């Protein structure tokens, strides 16, 4: 499985936020997306998740075009999304958060749903909060059950939105550990954030787009050694 | 002073947009009713534009203060959402000062609704009433067919006749059934006639004389009745709004004092709602700028409708002309005062 987004471009009333952005992500690899805020860094990610409809361009997950389908169509194609804000079902418990979406899975059985429910519960260390409602959880537990549901949708790709934003430095290692778990499950991972240090520390092949056009790509060292990103993004005094 | 002209311009343009929307809405509904009446009986097909033109001040009068309410609510909501009011009061702008800056446009609009309410409403309803009284004194078919059984407004009086004349001022086979005003003279009066003759006055109304009839002043099932054998009897019937006339100040008539208190009451209402909407616009949590709009419209209707209620009870309930309307304005004033002094009571009680 390999997802490709070819020649994405979004225009905003005479200002072209993104022009000619092409990106590819393979299953089992951590791909990053960074750049200035005015650049197509923010808009391109939304054009991939489906929140923002791309005016022109191609979005295909494994030979299946998902450009002009609703967000749920991309979800059935394998595109999962994980926003930064609270996405927990506040009035139903955690086991209801995972089972509620597990019942939508076509390729499961009631024994299969209970087995997968228990597997995700004891897998993400949320087994003790089976009684706590969504609104009762703390931040860490919140994000854990959010990721748990994201995996409970059985996606072939996951689009994380600001994972490292607002986490204490003690939790950054936990976030990296869970993202490495998602790596170990053969599911693609797209990461966008303003914490360039941790993202490049965890991302294998990150991209950098500026003023609409893709300007850089490659490993953490390839970007730290790239001169353009230090000129316009990193600022010569990185790390 | 840049804050003064800033917030003032925003509030004025916003309230102007809202008042334009509400004005088009109300004028479109009333237009649907007037074009409707003009289609049901072909009443004044050409000058319904003039009819609405006379109905404009009566609508703008009540629309302008609400447009001010939702105006400061929307504009100040905009300033709170985008953190402008936060850094505004984080510099040294007291909420009292904000209430003054907001209070100057309240004075302007108070003058506009004051001159409009005092001058343009009795004039518009006056011209509308004269046109309506002519085109409806000959087009409202107020005269009998003859047909039978015409009734007025409530149903207190009923005039019945079998024939009209060339002058549409003679009658034949008359019977009238009326009550007076209530408790006093509770009895129903009925008159029967062979020949009657109706006279209409150029100024208005109608006066009719009937010949060789009868007169009864008793209730059907009480056994108290009187008979009056007469041969000639002249009755003066009333008319085929009436209170909006001219600005004759509060005289012996309590209805004129009351209507003066209401017409005079609208701008004070503008001031009151202005006081209400300054603290009612604290939508800083960035979660609802459109939320307070419906409670503002509905609460404003609880102001206007209740004011009309006590203004209606001002004449027959004997509410002294210094108590009632200022009682209402004092109620909503108390609301605004409470809302404004919620936080200073916390801070001063803490001391």
């Amino acid at each position: 499985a390999t997802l490709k987004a070819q020649h994405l471009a979004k225009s905003y009333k005479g200002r072209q936020v993104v022009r000619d952005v092409s990106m590819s992500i393979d299953s089992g690899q951590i791909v990053g997306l960074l750049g200035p805020n005015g650049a197509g860094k923010t808009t391109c990610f939304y054009m991939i998740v489906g929140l923002v409809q791309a005016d022109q361009g191609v979005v295909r997950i494994d030979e299946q075009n998902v450009t002009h389908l609703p967000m749920h169509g991309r979800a059935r194609a394998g595109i999962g999304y994980l926003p930064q804000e609270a996405s927990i079902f506040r009035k139903l418990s955690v086991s209801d958060n995972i089972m509620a979406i597990l019942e939508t899975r076509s390729d499961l059985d009631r024994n299969g749903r209970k087995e997968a429910l228990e597997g995700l519960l004891q897998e993400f260390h949320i087994h003790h909060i089976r009684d706590n409602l969504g609104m009762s959880l703390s931040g860490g537990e919140r994000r854990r059950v959010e990721i748990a549901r994201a995996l409970a949708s059985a996606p072939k790709f996951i689009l994380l939105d600001e994972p490292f934003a607002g986490v204490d430095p003690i939790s950054v290692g936990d976030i990296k550990q869970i993202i490495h778990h998602l790596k170990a499950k053969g599911i693609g991972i797209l990461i966008t954030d303003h914490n360039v240090r941790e993202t490049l520390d965890i991302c294998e092949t990150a991209y950098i787009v500026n003023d609409g056009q893709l300007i850089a790509e490659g490993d953490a060292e390839s970007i730290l050694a790239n001169d353009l990103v230090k000129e316009v993004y990193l600022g010569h005094e990185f790390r | 002073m840049i804050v003064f002209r800033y917030l003032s311009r925003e509030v004025l343009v916003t309230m102007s947009a809202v008042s334009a929307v509400l004005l088009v809405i109300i004028m479109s509904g009333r237009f649907i009713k007037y074009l409707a009446q003009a289609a049901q009986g072909l009443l004044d097909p050409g000058s319904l534009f003039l009819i609405m033109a006379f109905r404009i001040p009566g609508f703008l009068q009540l629309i302008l203060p609400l447009g001010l309410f939702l105006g400061i609510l929307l504009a100040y909501g905009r300033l709170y959402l985008e953190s402008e009011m936060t850094v505004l009061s984080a510099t040294g702008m007291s909420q009292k000062r904000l209430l003054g800056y907001t209070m100057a446009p309240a004075l302007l609009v108070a003058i506009l609704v004051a001159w409009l309410s005092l001058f343009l409403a009795p004039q518009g309803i006056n011209q509308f009433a004269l046109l309506l009284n002519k085109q409806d004194t000959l087009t409202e078919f107020d005269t009998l067919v003859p047909g039978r059984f015409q009734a007025m407004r409530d149903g207190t009086r009923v005039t019945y006749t079998e024939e009209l004349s060339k002058d549409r001022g003679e009658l034949a086979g008359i019977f009238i059934s009326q009550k007076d005003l209530s408790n006093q003279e509770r009895g129903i009066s009925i008159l029967v006639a062979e020949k009657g003759t109706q006279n209409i006055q150029a100024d208005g109304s109608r006066y009719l004389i009937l010949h060789n009839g009868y007169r009864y002043d008793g209730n059907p099932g009480q056994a108290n009745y009187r008979a009056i054998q007469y041969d000639t009897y002249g009755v003066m019937l009333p008319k085929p709004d009436a209170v909006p006339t001219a600005d004759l100040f509060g005289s012996d008539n309590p209805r004129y004092q009351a209507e003066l208190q209401w017409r005079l009451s609208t701008p004070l209402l503008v001031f009151v709602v202005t006081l209400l909407a300054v603290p009612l616009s604290r939508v800083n949590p960035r979660q609802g700028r459109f939320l307070k709009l419906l409670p503002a419209i509905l609460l404003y209707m609880g102001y206007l409708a209740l004011l009309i209620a006590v203004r209606g009870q001002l004449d027959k309930g004997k509410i002294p002309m210094a108590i009632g309307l200022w009682w209402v304005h004092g109620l909503f004033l108390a609301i605004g005062l409470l809302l404004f002094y919620w936080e200073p009571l916390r801070l001063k009680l803490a001391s």
Binding site: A75, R76, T104 | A151, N219, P220, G288, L291, G302, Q313
Partner: protein, 351 residues
């Protein structure tokens, strides 16, 4: 798909219930505000409270569609406020599934609401208007609103209120001699119709010529037809009639050859109300919750209130215009409902 369906089901259900509670509270509040110009010292605040609260079971049914639209908007608005809906559809759940999950509690509250309003609203409403009219100005020979005046030979008849049960309330029988001398004025509280004749009850005939007799049982002397169209002009509006009363009345004037299309229209607005509500909220849920952009709850509820009032105006204009031109009454309510439905479908496919 049971946990999500019960989740959104309970949320939308309690949301609609709360909305109906608040709207009913404000409606009764303004009704009490407005009924304060009517007191005749005979009964005021107490009889007011009794009237309003007897009208509450009626008003709840009239509020049910609006409480359903706004209620669903509060359900999906609170669910989408906490970013639960966006991730709910970001996992493979289409919008139509959510629309059905919202619509099932609506169908429960509307199917259950029509029999609640039809079994409980007409009875409590009849008690309400009856007692209010009686203590306010009932038993008088004269009735507010509309009372029927008719003349048969040398006899004059006034009816306080004609009820669509074949019963006439407040029957006055003015019987003059040829000389016009009142040989009998009488009054009847209620009257029943039985095949060949009219039979009056609680009758009081008074006259003093060579007593004030009181007969409580039938008096049959009306060879007059008292035509069903003359009585049909005075019937109360079809709002108060039960649904079965609308059916039986529709077929009551149909046998007499009288036209019955207003009552067909009300019959269909009553019977197909869950359908037109389902289409209205289908289009509203599709239009407001369609785009992925985050919209605040006040803006969602506000724009949905705009939709409901706009289509409310649409049916209000499109009914009278539907039957003045003599179309079938079914398509009158079906065509706007199908327009909201198909528009909601196209908006669903837009997403």
């Amino acid at each position: 798909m049971v946990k999500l369906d019960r989740y959104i089901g309970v949320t939308v259900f309690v949301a609609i219930l709360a909305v109906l509670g608040v709207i009913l509270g404000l409606a009764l509040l303004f009704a009490f505000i407005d009924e304060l110009n009517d007191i005749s010292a005979s009964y005021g605040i107490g009889d007011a409270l009794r009237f309003i609260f007897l009208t509450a079971p009626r008003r709840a049914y009239d509020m049910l569609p609006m409480a359903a639209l706004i209620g669903c908007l509060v359900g999906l608005g609170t669910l989408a406020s906490n970013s639960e809906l966006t991730i709910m559809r970001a996992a493979g759940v289409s919008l139509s599934r959510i629309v059905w999950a919202v619509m099932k509690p609506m169908l429960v509250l509307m199917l259950a609401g029509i029999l609640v309003g039809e079994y409980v609203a007409p009875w409590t409403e009849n008690i309400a208007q009856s007692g209010r009219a009686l203590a306010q100005g009932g038993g008088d020979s004269q009735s507010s609103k509309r009372g029927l005046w008719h003349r048969q030979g040398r006899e004059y008849i006034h009816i306080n209120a004609v009820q669509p049960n074949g019963v006439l309330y407040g029957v006055t029988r003015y019987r003059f001699d040829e000389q016009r001398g009142l040989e009998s004025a009488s009054f009847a509280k209620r009257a029943r119709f039985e095949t060949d004749h009219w039979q009056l009850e609680e009758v009081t005939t008074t006259l003093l010529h060579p007593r004030s007799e009181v007969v409580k049982l039938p008096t049959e002397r009306w060879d007059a037809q008292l035509s069903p169209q003359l009585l049909n002009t005075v019937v109360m509006e079809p709002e108060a009639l039960s649904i079965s009363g609308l059916w039986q009345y529709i077929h009551y004037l149909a046998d007499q050859g009288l036209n019955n299309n207003r009552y067909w229209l009300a019959f269909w607005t009553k019977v197909l109300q869950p359908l037109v509500t389902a289409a209205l909220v289908l289009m509203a849920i599709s239009f407001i919750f369609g785009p992925l952009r985050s919209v605040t709850l006040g803006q969602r509820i506000f724009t949905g209130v705009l939709v409901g009032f706009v289509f409310r105006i649409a049916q209000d204009l499109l009914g009278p215009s539907s039957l003045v031109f003599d179309f079938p009454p079914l398509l009158a309510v079906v065509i706007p409902a199908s327009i909201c439905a198909l528009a909601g479908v196209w908006l669903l496919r837009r997403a």
